[model samples]
Target chain A: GKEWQENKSWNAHFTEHKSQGVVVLWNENKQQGFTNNLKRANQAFLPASTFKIPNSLIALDLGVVKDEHQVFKWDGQTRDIATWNRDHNLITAMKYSVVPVYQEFARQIGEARMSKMLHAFDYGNEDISGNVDSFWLDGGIRISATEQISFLRKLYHNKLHVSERSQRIVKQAMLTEANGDYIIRAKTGYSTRIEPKIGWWVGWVELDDNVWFFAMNMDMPTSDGLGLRQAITKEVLKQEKIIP
Target chain B: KEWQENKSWNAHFTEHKSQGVVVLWNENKQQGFTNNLKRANQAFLPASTFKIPNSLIALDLGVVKDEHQVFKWDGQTRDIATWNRDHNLITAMKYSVVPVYQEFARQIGEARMSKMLHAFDYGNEDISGNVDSFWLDGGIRISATEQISFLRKLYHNKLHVSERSQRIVKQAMLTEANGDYIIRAKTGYSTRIEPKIGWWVGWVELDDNVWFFAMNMDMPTSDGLGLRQAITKEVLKQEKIIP
Candidate 1:
């Protein structure tokens, strides 16, 4: 219930990259957290592909996509990314961050269900008022760094309104790496639809007895800046000793 | 570097109804962290954890053939069910089957065992009691701090023993492994003394860095056996050695 402690030390991370953004870290157990740029942390931005976390959850809950193994065939439109040019199950789709496969999932879930689930999830302003397939990318839907941490904490604890099975499936698809020491479950999002662009890296680190939720978003001045999303987040994580 | 006194770990020991000391040596940082500096330096019986060095010495002296070399059970019913059956070096280490290891000790004899303990610079280098029982209940003792020093040598193959022998023993010490981390450790419990002593000592390799930890706690009852590992793991987690 306490305000996030403003960690000015994290400012060096942003300054070094010549970017302005926010980084929010929430320790679920402590019920308190830390952030840099508290004002911007509460400021909303397009969910971008980061919406895939909730989108996957909604699809699984609605049975729009049967399960993680359900394959979405590539339409063969020749996407810019080679990995997206082939059929993908939920796991592979989330891995490659394939746009069209999830776009089709949005189409199938439709506006009514998507809107209903977002409200139930209490996600990112809960606004899907624009096109169903692209609202998270360019529509009215937006979420803040602080809000992302809250949402991810719920998903990590499986406290969301969605079925536990659906939550579990989506979480499994989110796992980036797992070792004896820690597990990283996350998603990266890049929003080119907005001015100056926004690069997002949001996820939670699962340690032996604790879980740390983090949400980071920075201004991406160039298309190549997408990589900064994770780079900056990892640098901050190292500073916090969340990773070796 | 100076060792950090981590008082935050006190609650873990309190929760287990025990008092303990923990020593964590970070291989990369060349620093140490501990709770209760005095107790960490105080020596106690090696108990079953001696199996680590014993296994290595046995391999080096050709006292045991390999990890697969089986020692047939003497058919004496032990209190622990798992230890009643035949055991190889690997299974013996896993079950902490005393009888099998005792057999290896007898085969290894006193002179070679004494020579190797000195060579390894383990504990006080005291094996003054019966050849087979010294590590378990005889004269041999090791402080938690000393345990970490010896473990560090084993971890880096810097011990006087052959590298292959250290590697074999290290492999046998493997308790848990996943894509991201590997934990090689041993647990020791010495019921031969008053208030008893339960020990858990090992190192964790994560992200290519090794963190060695040694913990010894008072075990007032048989029920506290699990506390050896439980307290050690909790301390390791708190210290950020394991996730």
Candidate 2:
């Protein structure tokens, strides 16, 4: 019980999802995020939830993708797809990390939006085609360590894309908790693939004028996630002095 | 052939210095200067007069690295550590119109110019690394392959410094343009590239988007500037893709 001290979990399945990649890093109080590729963890992870940040920022900046279509589509049914889109807002889908809603929002934003955003981030990843029409977000995009870190830094300064106020608002709704010394706006993601779900944690902490950022990925054998990742993230902010 | 050996022979006697880097790129016009660590080439020698084009282009671009300093690209000189030229990076420079990287290396300018030469490291199997500034302008250089690639990378929009400022410099140095086509250029020669020959090498940007152009070694080993214009006329056809 006390082996790992403060770590706990309600799920007992370790073979549920496979893990392939893991990477974690930190700065001070600004931001961080990671991909699920174990061997590929060091590489860029598809935006998934992280993509929401850009969506929200672009929505505000360009004034489209203005509405959202949020719903818990985990049950898998495209029967009411179009109608399902009418239920959410850009801010809520982002905070909840809703899938279909954001997917549709991306479609509305179009390929140009994706290309422009990639360019804005100085994104040199391959095949940036976001498809603008279907559920498929085209691939061929990569983010080296250097590029990710710099963009994460820019997120805090409202320099990435969104208007400053929109940046502040979106960042606020995403806050999950406050460590003893600082506040954090973070998210964790896991997918049900052959490999155990990857651990993805990206966000920032604020302390006065300085913002410390971080992003990391962790992979392990099947059905084995969320627990270790939550612990790893808590520890990183503390190490960066943004927490006690 | 005797003159060819003379120029190559002279190029062999020059010195090598390890120093600064110089890369100029123009985007709106689609033309640029590579002189970096991207690719390689092995052709022949460029003559002394080739230095003039680089000089004039720098002046036109206004991003001149060295005040108004000019230097000479001699039509003939051995690479013996004792020889020198005094043309400022200007006066000697001309255009097809105009250009640089050659103009700036009057003194400390060599560092940037030399760095680019070594960075694109493709010359031959031997790669002596013993290149001479004199030869660079005169009778010894490589082909267009690596040379063109090196130049292509610099025009990539993102640069080592300010992209905005770099783009501006790239835009200003254009002398040739089809107006609607957006083609611009820069050429180099030593009054003669080959014996009775004048080297003609420069790049051109076509239609404002894709970049296309090259370097030509024109020779007479013993002719007047008229030959330089003749060689240029031939190159212009290729430069414009006129067949």
Candidate 3:
């Protein structure tokens, strides 16, 4: 994906138990004179597993666990969640959003180190209040939808403070879908049973000569709520003509 | 105004970065419900709003001689500096002096209080909680619709309380005035109520018509200064419904 959107328009729409906010941004400095739902888009919420994007960058840049092929042996702890039972590398762990995999990375990276990395990136609230391991997930750290777009915009342009190699590898690792016309790289987040589930779907589409970045999140009341995040997002992207 | 024209007002409130519920009723019987209708319909603590009716009831019951009659401070310090001084009915209603109205409520008594409430049909008519603080906390709840109805009653002199009581209370409720028209309003902040609710409920008088509105906030903290007033005024200004 290479073509950047010439139109700089953003919109938000929601229904029922879920309230979804969407922000479609263009260019680096010059966008359209947008005066729509910019308020809701600026409000922050928990980043959830989307932190994995930066987590992967930190892990790769610091050589914490070597390369993407590197594997951490699973403890075989049959916890309540079924996804974390086995071992994982960069791609599979990210694809499944395995908590233990990223938690182990955080544990190995140490609190001071992860705090420094997140600070350098100016991540959301920049707070690791809950714990060293699960702050972004079960803790106090948060990121607005606009902040997500900003961080991803940097990662897309190799503008983050992390190493260029780390950024590229993390971006490659985030490739969720690929076709002849476009590649959709994104992350999904859910709060699970601990609270009323809130969902997040954040990423961008790379066209021929430009890229369009978007971040959308909403409440997940039913089982299909999570899927609706992608459904509504894709509907938006389709309307934008980002994907056929 | 048209629905599209009304939506711009909703846009203004949301764009200003505050969550709110507003119900506006024009003289033509056209109604505008903005933000959350469910919340607008839901009963919320009326906070200091009970003052409007409380003043009317006091005047009708002869608890105080008149607007100028004074009640001493009783030397009890209060959270608000404005509430600590001696106040008459006019000043008490103006500053929402809790102690002053608590005394008035005691003199009016529960039996007479029930009688007045039944006559006006205000809210749920349950003042069974703390005599001084029941409305502030949880004894009664009023939806935005109820707020408009009560204000409409007072604006048109239809509360059936009395000509003098209604006129005096309306004068006391005056927050602002100009050559073109007058603005009579009251603000209610429910401190003890969780999911704190703040209210600005009243009507405006113009050359030919009146506008009644109710705006409430359920923010964690108290409402900002003139938050409700700001919304009401802005909406009215944009619609040319005010001077």
Candidate 4:
């Protein structure tokens, strides 16, 4: 039965990858387990929910946007406006990756501050050159696995220049409610080009005091394919003794 | 005496890098060499002249923009005080004069494409107030070293397209030189970088036979002085022992 569960996990992962395609990494300290890459890590994909890490961080650090509880009024009319990716807040926007809302957020952060943040993170290094600060938000931000991982490590270390509480809040906000072993402070990111094909689960996994940080990216050709990435991560945890 | 001169080359390359920079690569029947970055295969300064390669390969392959050429295609042009709209591709687009976009630029024709440099990545493309857009003539361009290497690889059949395509592209684009070296070359310049430097360069080499290329990027990092780094790529080639 135990082996069967593992096989099921792997099968799910295979199916997810077939549809979505992926570039992912994950780590768990207790098991001394880490999978650094799935394949094609250099292929630049939109940060989707992963971008929220920087988006929300910038909003807070620069005071351009406020706290998790700070409510900005929204009429809740989810129109397919040509501009708005789908109107919402950090949570709502983070959930669906609403384009218009983030654009407004960028505008609120202003070009100068927004560009500064993007450049600082060195997003999409393969594509970045010249005045990286200028074109960052103009489809300016794309990141590779290496860059995303480094930032995640920094977050686990609490060295990202922010309060630990703020970091933890962002992490907790991204958890999946389904039944799974151990707590996963993770986020799912995607776009319509291949919606949900990519399930990016990034966060710190705490087993006792060994808080291991990880960035898991699983992208398939389609959205439903995300199930494979999700299964792969769970499987990784089990194979490496990360979960019972 | 020979090795001493090699030190001089290092000193020169270092100095040039400090000022602006240069990246060059070339190969012939029995020789292949690269200065500056031996490991770095990507073009360093190919911001503008990049159009030529994109155009050539696309023209040869017959594949146009695929969300392609994220840089300006120059395909959309009408006569104006503009640069790329000129009669010829070289004098206008390749020469880096004003109006760099050309009708053929839109033909970014057939070639497998890859993801574009993130608009915020790094290098002259990011610096030039440009973004990697698919709009006609509204995207960023390249630096010189990239163009030279591109020509080198083009003839060497490195682009992984088709041999027939490469030879055809090379024949049409390159120039005939004194040493029987056929040079498919292009040059270019962009707007003010910083305050004074006018980004410019031109690079070319032969068709898998003999190679020769020269480029100069000019712009003032300070207030009114254009950096013009292409001088070094030219000088290095001049000092070479060509047969």
What TM-score does each of the candidates earn? 0.52, 0.38, 0.48, 0.39
Q: Point out the higher-scoring one by DockQ: 1 or 4.
A: 1
| Tens-digit per-residue lDDT, A1-244, candidate 1 | 6757888898898889788888898877688889888898898999898999999998898889887657688898997788888888887787778989999999999998898888988898998977999998889998999889889988977799988778877876776765445667899888888764888889998663468899998988787767677778878889988888
- Cα lDDT tens digits for candidate 2, B122-186: 23212223233554433235544433443454345332334333333333323333212223334
Candidate 3 segments whose C-alpha is farther than 4 A from its true place: A1-244, B1-7, B29-35
Which candidate, 1 or 3, would have the higher DockQ against the true structure?
1
Candidate 4 per-residue lDDT over residues A1-244, each given as its tens digit: 1111112333344464453333333343423323333344455555655666776777767765565445444446666543232334554455444554555555677766666666665545524222323233334356655557667766655566666545544553443321113444555565443333455665555442245455556544555565555566666566557567
DockQ of each two-chain model: 0.06, 0.01, 0.00, 0.00
- Across residues B78-132, which tens digit of lDDT does each residue of candidate 3 receive? 8899887888876786778888888988888878887888888888888777666
Q: DockQ for model 4? A: 0.00
**Worst 10 contiguous positions by lDDT, candidate 3 chain A:** A27-36
Q: Highest DockQ among the candidates is held by which one?
A: 1
Rank by TM-score (best first):
1, 3, 4, 2
Off by over 4 Å in 2: A1-23, A28-42, A65-86, A124-126, A133-138, A144-146, A191-197, A220-224, A239-241, B1-243
**B60-176 in candidate 4: lDDT tens per residue?**
545532211323435655444443332333233323433333334334321222322331121233323222222213334343444454455665566656554544444334322
Error of 1 at B223 (Å): 30
- Report the Cα lDDT for residue B199, model 1: 88
Lowest lDDT block of 10, candidate 3 chain B: B1-10
* Local distance difference test scores for all models: 0.84, 0.42, 0.73, 0.44
| Candidate with more favorable, higher TM-score: 2 or 4 | 4
Query: Can you give the lDDT of residue B193 in candidate 4?
Result: 33
> What's the residue-level lDDT of A115 in candidate 4?
64
